[PDB]
Design an enzyme around this catalytic site. Structure first.
Site, mmCIF file in Angstrom:
data_model
loop_
_atom_site.group_PDB
_atom_site.id
_atom_site.type_symbol
_atom_site.label_atom_id
_atom_site.label_comp_id
_atom_site.label_asym_id
_atom_site.label_seq_id
_atom_site.Cartn_x
_atom_site.Cartn_y
_atom_site.Cartn_z
ATOM 1 N N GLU A 1 11.519 -20.524 13.642
ATOM 2 C CA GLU A 1 10.815 -21.527 14.430
ATOM 3 C C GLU A 1 11.390 -23.037 14.087
ATOM 4 O O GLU A 1 12.075 -23.202 12.955
ATOM 5 C CB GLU A 1 9.489 -21.221 13.886
ATOM 6 C CG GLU A 1 8.450 -22.762 13.598
ATOM 7 C CD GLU A 1 6.884 -22.289 13.050
ATOM 8 O OE1 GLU A 1 7.183 -21.041 12.682
ATOM 9 O OE2 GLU A 1 6.208 -23.229 12.941
ATOM 10 N N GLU B 1 5.355 -31.654 13.773
ATOM 11 C CA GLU B 1 3.716 -31.781 13.430
ATOM 12 C C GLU B 1 3.361 -32.784 12.954
ATOM 13 O O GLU B 1 3.881 -33.841 12.230
ATOM 14 C CB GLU B 1 3.548 -30.395 12.153
ATOM 15 C CG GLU B 1 3.913 -29.025 12.711
ATOM 16 C CD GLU B 1 4.212 -28.207 11.599
ATOM 17 O OE1 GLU B 1 4.769 -28.360 10.415
ATOM 18 O OE2 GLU B 1 3.290 -27.127 11.600
#
Ligand SMILES: [Ca+2]
Length: 214
Positions: free
Chosen positions: A105, A109
């Site tokens: 991944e 964020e």
């Protein structure tokens, strides 16, 4: 990989490219349940994710994910994260055990507690701990900006409005994953995100998305 280059202006909700998470909680640190109603289109041509509450101390959140998988290349997102302590707004690539692969991944964020910063991270075969916090020089929550990551075989480069902000060269992910976006409130991670204060509704907006194959 199953997907190719594409440009998503969000003029409509393309069910051929995307799908909404619905009816379950990720568990662990996620203190909310994904609901299809929490993913919607605005009249201004934007995809909106929302954080709402259906009852006392219960929360509903949103998650949009791609139908196909994507590999090496340039990933761009023009967005505006939500602003509030205890939450996270994101843009990331993901694939994992559930899909019968290693946990690979790449993330972008926004910690609701401070929208003047952005956090970059990545997981390769389930190993993370690559957090990198960068000062944006502005409040991401006030306007739209273009965030991107160039995922190459031996490197990952992150950009903010075309400007290179961080580079990673070790243990680079290799498995193609789905493009995802989410907005959620956490639990058990007060040191990281701050304690969620139950304020709703909260929104994260996505103006456009683009993926350019290698
Ligand atoms: Ca748009």
């Amino acid at each position: 990989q199953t997907g190719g280059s594409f440009y998503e202006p969000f003029n409509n909700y393309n069910t051929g490219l995307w799908q909404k998470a619905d009816g379950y909680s990720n568990g662990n640190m996620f203190n909310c349940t994904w609901r299809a109603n929490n993913v919607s289109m605005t009249s201004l041509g934007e995809m909106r994710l929302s954080l709402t509450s259906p009852s006392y101390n219960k929360f509903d959140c949103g998650e949009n994910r791609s139908v196909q998988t994507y590999g090496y290349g340039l990933y761009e997102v023009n967005m505006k994260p939500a602003k509030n302590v205890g939450i996270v707004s994101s843009f990331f690539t993901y694939t994992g055990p559930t899909d019968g692969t290693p946990w690979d991944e790449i993330d972008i964020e926004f910690l609701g507690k401070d929208t003047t910063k952005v956090q970059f991270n990545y997981y390769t075969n389930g190993v993370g701990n690559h957090e990198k916090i960068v000062n944006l020089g502005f409040d991401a929550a006030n306007s739209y900006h273009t965030y991107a990551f160039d995922w190459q075989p031996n490197s990952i480069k992150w950009y903010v409005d075309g400007q290179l902000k961080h580079t990673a060269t070790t243990q680079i992910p290799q498995t193609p994953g789905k493009i995802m976006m989410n907005l959620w409130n956490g639990a058990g991670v007060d040191e990281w995100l701050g304690s969620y204060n139950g304020v709703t509704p909260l929104y994260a907006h996505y103006n456009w998305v683009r993926y350019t194959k290698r």
